Amino acid sequence: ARTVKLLLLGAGESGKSTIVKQMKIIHQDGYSLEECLEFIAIIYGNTLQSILAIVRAMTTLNIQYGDSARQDDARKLMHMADTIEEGTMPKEMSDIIQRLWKDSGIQACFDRASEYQLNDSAGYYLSDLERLVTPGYVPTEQDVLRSRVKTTGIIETQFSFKDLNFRMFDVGGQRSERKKWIHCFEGVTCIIFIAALSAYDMVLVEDDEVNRMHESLHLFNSICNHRYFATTSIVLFLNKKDVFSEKIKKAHLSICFPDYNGPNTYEDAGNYIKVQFLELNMRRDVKEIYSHMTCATDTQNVKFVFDAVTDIIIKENLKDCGL
């Protein structure tokens, strides 16, 4: 059996750990009931942190509530957040959150997410708070998949697929978590580099003066043209195609790429983004980098993109297991 050392790289929140959860579902035993119950505290914490961030932005963005009474809910919320048991969601809390989300000022702020820092799954959980809070709540896979926890260490996933024994490694992509990346570059059969399509109008959590996609582009440049990776198969997942789809129709790609020309559309601007990343490949002549529009939260999609990825691994047979 061939051993494939695979590295998931990309900037913060690009979707690397969600691809890991997918491998568990698609290629391992999937989630047990008890594991699912472990995500409730995460889901509840994510719901709380996402609403607090929209409330908080009400001020910084100078946005009034569609009903000044919601201001009462906001404070109370802020107070409960420092008093509730971490990861919990009492009825008193979700009632307040349910009213705030139903407020049009809040909805105006939510829509201006790009202007501040808000979880990807904010709308996903808030819009469905009622269910998440229905007594007897045990998460679904999409709920678990929508989950968010910044990766601070290194995580390995091993599974057998098409007779290759994968050794997949997950790591945080935020600036401070990149420092350790170097110790992992030894003997890499393949890298799936992940970039969020929807990050073209966002700013870094690390430096609000740095666009997320330029950073991603720089990192890609450093990884793509890296010594160790001479052989190494490199694939680009242009991720969060679903969000890019909704986003493209409203925000100008020019905000990221001042020189960008065409119809601010999905097929067209998505391709432009593919090029800006692939142009970076100083070895485009000799190498050819396989990219694809992906939705990491979409099981069947990841299942089909990975099967193609691994068919590459199998094809362009090369280097494997490091050390």
Ligand SMILES: Nc1nc2c(ncn2[C@@H]2O[C@H](COP(=O)(O)OP(=O)(O)OP(O)(O)=S)[C@@H](O)[C@H]2O)c(=O)[nH]1
């Ligand atoms: N809508 C949507 N949400 C996604 C997609 N991929 C990931 N997410 C959501 O984005 C959040 C961030 O992704 P996550 O997998 O945690 O990123 P990461 O790149 O591993 O993050 P880090 O550890 O480097 S900070 C999660 O809440 C996750 O469910 C996607 O294709 N579409």
Ligand SMILES: [Mg+2]
């Ligand atoms: Mg992660």
